[PDB]
Amino acid sequence: PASSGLTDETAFSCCSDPDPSTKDFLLQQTMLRIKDPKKSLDFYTRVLGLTLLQKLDFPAMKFSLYFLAYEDKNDIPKDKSEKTAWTFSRKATLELTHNWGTEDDETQSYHNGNSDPRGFGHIGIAVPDVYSACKRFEELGVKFVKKPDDGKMKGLAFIQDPDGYWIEILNPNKIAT
Amino acid sequence: SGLTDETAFSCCSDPDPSTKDFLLQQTMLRIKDPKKSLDFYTRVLGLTLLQKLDFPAMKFSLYFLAYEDKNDIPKDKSEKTAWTFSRKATLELTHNWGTEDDETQSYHNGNSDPRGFGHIGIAVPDVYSACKRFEELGVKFVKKPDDGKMKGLAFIQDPDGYWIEILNPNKIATII
Ligand SMILES: O=C(O)Cc1nn(Cc2nc3cc(C(F)(F)F)ccc3s2)c(=O)c2ccccc12
Ligand SMILES: [Zn+2]
Ligand SMILES: [Zn+2]
Secondary structure, rough: OOOOOOHHHHHHHOOOOOHHHHOEEEEEEEEEEOOOOOHHHHHHHHOOOOEEEEEEEEEOOOOOEEEEEEHHHOOOOOOOOHHHHHHOOOOOEEEEEEEEHHHHHHHOOOOOOEEEEEEEEEEEEEEOEEEEEHHHHHHHHHHHHHHHOOOOOOOOOOOOOOOOEEEEEHHHHHHHO | OOHHHHHHHHOOOOOOOOHOOOOOEEEEEOOOOOHHHHHHHHHHHEEEEEEEEEEEHHHHHHHHEEEOHHHHOOOHHHHHHHHHHOOOEEEEEEEEEEEHHHOOOOOOOOOOOOOOOEEEEEOOOOOHHHHHHHHOOOOOOEEEEOOOOOOOOOEOOOOOOOOEEEOOOOHHHHHH
């Protein structure tokens, strides 16, 4: 018999209460490789309103890490070890990995995971209003994967960041619609 | 060479007030076997299935998981949804019906060519207990906590080969 996926019963039967040893675990980051941190920084801060928590450089290994999150910049400790302990204990951060030199390599780009080979699909951002969010996006020149009133599910948008990664733009109080 | 701090910082804008209450809601991974995947993230990693949405028309299911007490999950089917998509730091797992039965099928983890997405990462109080327990349960490892230069940090794999990083935020500054 063909897969018609799991019933909710099979689904929840596979689910377990968290072992108590896991009770302070925290989903801390999603890492995406980025070609140009100038574009990506502009994009995430100026377009989507994230804040740059910390920039870490690895000279020996030739990359930097940029952690972005929705956090007030006045909360960031300014001292390096204190910044670090604070950043890595934030929930929901983006870690953008810049392998140095990819910005000036015109033969290099990353793969967004949405065409062969497929894997990762997107990150997603909850907004209060998708239609003003998207109208604002149009005004600033964001490439769209899906306009909110386009395609099948109206009220749901997918935009792209400067590397092509998909970003769902979503209204949590109108998803069940 | 890399960007200097000054170039990087000068590419950062303050958030437009328009973006007030935007929140980083979800990261989506395509998964081969939702039985394996749900068992892993709940039993092994301690996350909680918040909701399941099915779409028979396109032959796919979505599973949402977060570190959340199941006693906050509104029972009301309309209000459960609203709550779920309002939680921060969620995983949307996407099962395309069929794939669990096709031995030729696996997803790409983004860590070999063509590279992209790299990993998710989980903040833990103690990487060694965490991993000792992962090892005990048969979790497959990329980097064990003692392996390599960065000791105190691990990478494990989920049932799809997606790399999950394990770190202690209090130890990061020493490690690096
Ligand atoms: O990923 C990038 O784009 C850059 C990159 N490189 N490296 C160096 C590596 N150390 C490894 C160790 C193993 C090992 F198998 F030995 F564990 C396997 C693979 C690797 S890559 C990282 O450690 C890393 C961590 C976060 C973000 C980006 C990177
Ligand atoms: Zn990482
Ligand atoms: Zn999604």
